[PDB]
Amino acid sequence: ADTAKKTLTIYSTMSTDSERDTFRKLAAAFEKEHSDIHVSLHFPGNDYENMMRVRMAANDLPDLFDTHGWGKIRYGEYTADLRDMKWTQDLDPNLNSILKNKSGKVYAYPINQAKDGLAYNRNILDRYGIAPPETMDDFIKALRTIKEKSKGSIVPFWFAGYDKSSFAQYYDQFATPLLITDPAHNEKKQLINGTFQWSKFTYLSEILKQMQKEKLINIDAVTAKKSQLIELMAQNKIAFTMQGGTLGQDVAQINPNVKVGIIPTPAIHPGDDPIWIGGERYTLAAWKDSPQLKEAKDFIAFMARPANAKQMAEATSLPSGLTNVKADIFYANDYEYYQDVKVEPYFDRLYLPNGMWDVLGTVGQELAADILAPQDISQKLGREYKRLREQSET
Ligand SMILES: [Cl-]
Ligand SMILES: [Cl-]
Ligand SMILES: [Cl-]
Ligand SMILES: [Cl-]
Ligand SMILES: [Cl-]
């Protein structure tokens, strides 16, 4: 260590080599402009939550940290208000409800943003005359069409069911149109206050069971692995799958003749609009009590400069959080086509106690394996919801 420098500690949930390497390159560029700062960048991976929990309890936070979809709920008491920073004038308005309170606090700087729906093979849908589905009913009808017309040669909706998170993603994304987006058919208040009736969730298990029974998902869903997806998609073997984020670009590298697109998550209730799911992905929040708060803010401002924000966003394959930055990403075409579609945060992060992600994955895998029936799943979910609320409380 150089004792003529002070250390600025930054925690990140970034996972890929492109993300980590680009963040390090930008940290090095920051250091060129600030000869007295050594940036200490940490990527704790699976240990992130445990380490931040202990650091919060110790009142010993990193100077900058990633809130990764939990900005208000988990980090509200520790974050510096960023409302007086210059970059806030360009915050994507789709992020206002997620990264601000109505009373004006800006909780964190969004490096990027997540917008998840369904990924699909454009050519397959054109072969069979299928328009992008905007409702669950139209989605299922498309799956039936693909099964009928392909005579079983194309998987209509593919799951890597070996990994329970594949089913969790299904439940989590579709819980938003089911329970959140429609003012006449939502349960926001009941979810937050513990009175939610899990009988209202059964619909999603019924749909999944319909897809299984009707051979609209892959026959091998219980044993299919994430590592198989790119090759199968590039071989024109899959019509739809839940969005993973880099599928199109990865497939194009192997077979440029296959064009993968994305669409928003279909709506469920009549008259409701399709929705993008995500919002926060990676953020930089400053610890309000950091002795190096000024430097932390200088680093955020540096990251928010358009050339830097574009670079970082592109490494993550997602749009920037700022309107003055147009990251050249693979799905940019589709995000422009769907520019007026709204964004909802991930259901589990806002509406369920911590721990429910794994439970959603569990029950979906047990459904696919014919261990649990839809009615019994909702009862298990309710029990875990109650238990995990009781534990997060006490
Ligand atoms: Cl965390
Ligand atoms: Cl897997
Ligand atoms: Cl994707
Ligand atoms: Cl962008
Ligand atoms: Cl979990």
Side-chain angles (χ1 to χ4, degrees), residues 116 118-120 229 241-249 260-262 330-331:
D116 289 334
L118 301 171
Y120 69 100
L229 170 59
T241 196
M242 301 294 304
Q243 201 170 317
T246 60
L247 183 59
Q249 66 201 232
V260 178
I262 55 167
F330 185 90
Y331 295 132

PDB file of all heavy atoms in Angstrom, residues 116 118-120 229 241-249 260-262 330-331, ligand 3:
ATOM      1  N   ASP A 116     -37.050  -7.127 -18.134  1.00  0.00           N
ATOM      2  CA  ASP A 116     -37.229  -8.536 -18.470  1.00  0.00           C
ATOM      3  C   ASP A 116     -38.659  -8.830 -18.908  1.00  0.00           C
ATOM      4  O   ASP A 116     -39.670  -8.356 -18.300  1.00  0.00           O
ATOM      5  CB  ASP A 116     -36.911  -9.409 -17.259  1.00  0.00           C
ATOM      6  CG  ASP A 116     -35.439  -9.455 -16.927  1.00  0.00           C
ATOM      7  OD1 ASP A 116     -34.582  -9.265 -17.819  1.00  0.00           O
ATOM      8  OD2 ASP A 116     -35.138  -9.727 -15.741  1.00  0.00           O
ATOM      9  N   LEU A 118     -39.938 -11.888 -22.184  1.00  0.00           N
ATOM     10  CA  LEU A 118     -39.676 -13.170 -22.804  1.00  0.00           C
ATOM     11  C   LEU A 118     -38.712 -12.993 -23.976  1.00  0.00           C
ATOM     12  O   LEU A 118     -38.865 -12.025 -24.762  1.00  0.00           O
ATOM     13  CB  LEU A 118     -40.975 -13.771 -23.355  1.00  0.00           C
ATOM     14  CG  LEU A 118     -42.092 -14.004 -22.375  1.00  0.00           C
ATOM     15  CD1 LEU A 118     -43.369 -14.394 -23.077  1.00  0.00           C
ATOM     16  CD2 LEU A 118     -41.729 -15.092 -21.386  1.00  0.00           C
ATOM     17  N   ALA A 119     -37.797 -13.927 -24.121  1.00  0.00           N
ATOM     18  CA  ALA A 119     -36.943 -14.012 -25.296  1.00  0.00           C
ATOM     19  C   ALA A 119     -37.559 -14.988 -26.290  1.00  0.00           C
ATOM     20  O   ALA A 119     -38.207 -15.962 -25.909  1.00  0.00           O
ATOM     21  CB  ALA A 119     -35.560 -14.462 -24.927  1.00  0.00           C
ATOM     22  N   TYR A 120     -37.370 -14.730 -27.597  1.00  0.00           N
ATOM     23  CA  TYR A 120     -38.015 -15.564 -28.578  1.00  0.00           C
ATOM     24  C   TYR A 120     -37.253 -15.570 -29.892  1.00  0.00           C
ATOM     25  O   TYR A 120     -36.511 -14.642 -30.202  1.00  0.00           O
ATOM     26  CB  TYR A 120     -39.452 -15.101 -28.831  1.00  0.00           C
ATOM     27  CG  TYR A 120     -39.558 -13.783 -29.545  1.00  0.00           C
ATOM     28  CD1 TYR A 120     -39.818 -13.733 -30.912  1.00  0.00           C
ATOM     29  CD2 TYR A 120     -39.315 -12.571 -28.896  1.00  0.00           C
ATOM     30  CE1 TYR A 120     -39.909 -12.545 -31.572  1.00  0.00           C
ATOM     31  CE2 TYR A 120     -39.393 -11.356 -29.579  1.00  0.00           C
ATOM     32  CZ  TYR A 120     -39.698 -11.357 -30.906  1.00  0.00           C
ATOM     33  OH  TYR A 120     -39.717 -10.143 -31.596  1.00  0.00           O
ATOM     34  N   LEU A 229     -28.831 -24.028 -23.236  1.00  0.00           N
ATOM     35  CA  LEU A 229     -29.761 -23.094 -23.850  1.00  0.00           C
ATOM     36  C   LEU A 229     -29.225 -22.486 -25.147  1.00  0.00           C
ATOM     37  O   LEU A 229     -29.930 -22.444 -26.165  1.00  0.00           O
ATOM     38  CB  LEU A 229     -30.117 -21.978 -22.845  1.00  0.00           C
ATOM     39  CG  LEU A 229     -30.921 -20.779 -23.432  1.00  0.00           C
ATOM     40  CD1 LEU A 229     -32.235 -21.238 -24.038  1.00  0.00           C
ATOM     41  CD2 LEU A 229     -31.106 -19.701 -22.386  1.00  0.00           C
ATOM     42  N   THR A 241     -38.328 -18.456 -24.342  1.00  0.00           N
ATOM     43  CA  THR A 241     -37.755 -18.781 -23.030  1.00  0.00           C
ATOM     44  C   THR A 241     -37.781 -17.525 -22.191  1.00  0.00           C
ATOM     45  O   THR A 241     -37.900 -16.442 -22.734  1.00  0.00           O
ATOM     46  CB  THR A 241     -36.351 -19.429 -23.141  1.00  0.00           C
ATOM     47  OG1 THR A 241     -36.008 -20.045 -21.906  1.00  0.00           O
ATOM     48  CG2 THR A 241     -35.272 -18.415 -23.513  1.00  0.00           C
ATOM     49  N   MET A 242     -37.715 -17.653 -20.867  1.00  0.00           N
ATOM     50  CA  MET A 242     -37.649 -16.465 -20.022  1.00  0.00           C
ATOM     51  C   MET A 242     -36.353 -15.748 -20.235  1.00  0.00           C
ATOM     52  O   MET A 242     -35.313 -16.347 -20.533  1.00  0.00           O
ATOM     53  CB  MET A 242     -37.770 -16.833 -18.549  1.00  0.00           C
ATOM     54  CG  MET A 242     -39.021 -17.567 -18.099  1.00  0.00           C
ATOM     55  SD  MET A 242     -40.628 -16.794 -18.141  1.00  0.00           S
ATOM     56  CE  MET A 242     -40.355 -15.310 -17.126  1.00  0.00           C
ATOM     57  N   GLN A 243     -36.418 -14.418 -20.138  1.00  0.00           N
ATOM     58  CA  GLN A 243     -35.255 -13.654 -20.531  1.00  0.00           C
ATOM     59  C   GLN A 243     -34.083 -13.861 -19.595  1.00  0.00           C
ATOM     60  O   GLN A 243     -34.234 -13.786 -18.375  1.00  0.00           O
ATOM     61  CB  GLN A 243     -35.656 -12.223 -20.531  1.00  0.00           C
ATOM     62  CG  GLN A 243     -34.765 -11.373 -21.356  1.00  0.00           C
ATOM     63  CD  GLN A 243     -35.392 -10.037 -21.474  1.00  0.00           C
ATOM     64  OE1 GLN A 243     -36.609  -9.945 -21.691  1.00  0.00           O
ATOM     65  NE2 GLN A 243     -34.594  -9.001 -21.381  1.00  0.00           N
ATOM     66  N   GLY A 244     -32.916 -14.116 -20.177  1.00  0.00           N
ATOM     67  CA  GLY A 244     -31.674 -14.227 -19.410  1.00  0.00           C
ATOM     68  C   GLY A 244     -30.742 -13.026 -19.566  1.00  0.00           C
ATOM     69  O   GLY A 244     -29.897 -12.761 -18.697  1.00  0.00           O
ATOM     70  N   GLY A 245     -30.879 -12.304 -20.679  1.00  0.00           N
ATOM     71  CA  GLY A 245     -30.165 -11.044 -20.869  1.00  0.00           C
ATOM     72  C   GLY A 245     -29.134 -11.031 -21.991  1.00  0.00           C
ATOM     73  O   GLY A 245     -28.931  -9.986 -22.581  1.00  0.00           O
ATOM     74  N   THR A 246     -28.446 -12.132 -22.237  1.00  0.00           N
ATOM     75  CA  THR A 246     -27.415 -12.141 -23.288  1.00  0.00           C
ATOM     76  C   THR A 246     -27.677 -13.205 -24.338  1.00  0.00           C
ATOM     77  O   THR A 246     -26.802 -13.540 -25.124  1.00  0.00           O
ATOM     78  CB  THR A 246     -26.005 -12.331 -22.751  1.00  0.00           C
ATOM     79  OG1 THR A 246     -25.926 -13.593 -22.047  1.00  0.00           O
ATOM     80  CG2 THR A 246     -25.630 -11.184 -21.805  1.00  0.00           C
ATOM     81  N   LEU A 247     -28.886 -13.732 -24.376  1.00  0.00           N
ATOM     82  CA  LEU A 247     -29.146 -14.880 -25.235  1.00  0.00           C
ATOM     83  C   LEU A 247     -28.968 -14.521 -26.704  1.00  0.00           C
ATOM     84  O   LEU A 247     -28.316 -15.267 -27.468  1.00  0.00           O
ATOM     85  CB  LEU A 247     -30.540 -15.488 -24.994  1.00  0.00           C
ATOM     86  CG  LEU A 247     -30.903 -16.755 -25.810  1.00  0.00           C
ATOM     87  CD1 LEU A 247     -29.935 -17.892 -25.555  1.00  0.00           C
ATOM     88  CD2 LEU A 247     -32.339 -17.217 -25.531  1.00  0.00           C
ATOM     89  N   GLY A 248     -29.549 -13.396 -27.114  1.00  0.00           N
ATOM     90  CA  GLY A 248     -29.495 -12.991 -28.511  1.00  0.00           C
ATOM     91  C   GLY A 248     -28.077 -12.860 -28.979  1.00  0.00           C
ATOM     92  O   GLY A 248     -27.675 -13.364 -30.011  1.00  0.00           O
ATOM     93  N   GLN A 249     -27.277 -12.151 -28.190  1.00  0.00           N
ATOM     94  CA  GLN A 249     -25.914 -11.859 -28.624  1.00  0.00           C
ATOM     95  C   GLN A 249     -25.072 -13.137 -28.636  1.00  0.00           C
ATOM     96  O   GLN A 249     -24.213 -13.365 -29.525  1.00  0.00           O
ATOM     97  CB  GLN A 249     -25.306 -10.732 -27.750  1.00  0.00           C
ATOM     98  CG  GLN A 249     -25.060 -11.030 -26.247  1.00  0.00           C
ATOM     99  CD  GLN A 249     -24.954  -9.812 -25.308  1.00  0.00           C
ATOM    100  OE1 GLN A 249     -23.995  -9.672 -24.536  1.00  0.00           O
ATOM    101  NE2 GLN A 249     -25.939  -8.997 -25.324  1.00  0.00           N
ATOM    102  N   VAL A 260     -32.738 -13.539 -32.149  1.00  0.00           N
ATOM    103  CA  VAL A 260     -33.486 -13.613 -30.880  1.00  0.00           C
ATOM    104  C   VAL A 260     -33.896 -12.203 -30.504  1.00  0.00           C
ATOM    105  O   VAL A 260     -33.075 -11.286 -30.469  1.00  0.00           O
ATOM    106  CB  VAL A 260     -32.637 -14.228 -29.747  1.00  0.00           C
ATOM    107  CG1 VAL A 260     -33.418 -14.243 -28.432  1.00  0.00           C
ATOM    108  CG2 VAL A 260     -32.189 -15.632 -30.155  1.00  0.00           C
ATOM    109  N   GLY A 261     -35.179 -12.027 -30.223  1.00  0.00           N
ATOM    110  CA  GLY A 261     -35.755 -10.789 -29.757  1.00  0.00           C
ATOM    111  C   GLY A 261     -36.280 -10.916 -28.343  1.00  0.00           C
ATOM    112  O   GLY A 261     -36.311 -12.004 -27.785  1.00  0.00           O
ATOM    113  N   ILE A 262     -36.681  -9.782 -27.784  1.00  0.00           N
ATOM    114  CA  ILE A 262     -37.386  -9.777 -26.493  1.00  0.00           C
ATOM    115  C   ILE A 262     -38.689  -9.014 -26.604  1.00  0.00           C
ATOM    116  O   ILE A 262     -38.829  -8.093 -27.420  1.00  0.00           O
ATOM    117  CB  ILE A 262     -36.514  -9.233 -25.312  1.00  0.00           C
ATOM    118  CG1 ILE A 262     -35.967  -7.837 -25.633  1.00  0.00           C
ATOM    119  CG2 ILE A 262     -35.395 -10.200 -25.017  1.00  0.00           C
ATOM    120  CD1 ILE A 262     -35.370  -7.079 -24.480  1.00  0.00           C
ATOM    121  N   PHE A 330     -27.321  -5.257 -27.526  1.00  0.00           N
ATOM    122  CA  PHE A 330     -27.948  -6.144 -28.500  1.00  0.00           C
ATOM    123  C   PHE A 330     -29.459  -5.929 -28.632  1.00  0.00           C
ATOM    124  O   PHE A 330     -29.998  -5.889 -29.770  1.00  0.00           O
ATOM    125  CB  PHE A 330     -27.609  -7.607 -28.202  1.00  0.00           C
ATOM    126  CG  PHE A 330     -28.121  -8.539 -29.246  1.00  0.00           C
ATOM    127  CD1 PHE A 330     -27.331  -8.855 -30.331  1.00  0.00           C
ATOM    128  CD2 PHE A 330     -29.370  -9.097 -29.135  1.00  0.00           C
ATOM    129  CE1 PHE A 330     -27.802  -9.737 -31.311  1.00  0.00           C
ATOM    130  CE2 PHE A 330     -29.822  -9.970 -30.118  1.00  0.00           C
ATOM    131  CZ  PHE A 330     -29.031 -10.291 -31.179  1.00  0.00           C
ATOM    132  N   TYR A 331     -30.141  -5.737 -27.504  1.00  0.00           N
ATOM    133  CA  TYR A 331     -31.590  -5.571 -27.547  1.00  0.00           C
ATOM    134  C   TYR A 331     -32.046  -4.124 -27.651  1.00  0.00           C
ATOM    135  O   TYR A 331     -33.225  -3.797 -27.424  1.00  0.00           O
ATOM    136  CB  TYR A 331     -32.247  -6.208 -26.324  1.00  0.00           C
ATOM    137  CG  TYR A 331     -32.096  -7.711 -26.257  1.00  0.00           C
ATOM    138  CD1 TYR A 331     -31.676  -8.285 -25.089  1.00  0.00           C
ATOM    139  CD2 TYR A 331     -32.435  -8.545 -27.319  1.00  0.00           C
ATOM    140  CE1 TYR A 331     -31.562  -9.656 -24.957  1.00  0.00           C
ATOM    141  CE2 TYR A 331     -32.315  -9.934 -27.193  1.00  0.00           C
ATOM    142  CZ  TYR A 331     -31.896 -10.460 -26.027  1.00  0.00           C
ATOM    143  OH  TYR A 331     -31.785 -11.870 -25.921  1.00  0.00           O
TER     144      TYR A 331
HETATM  145 CL    CL B   3     -32.068 -12.909 -23.139  1.00  0.00          CL
END
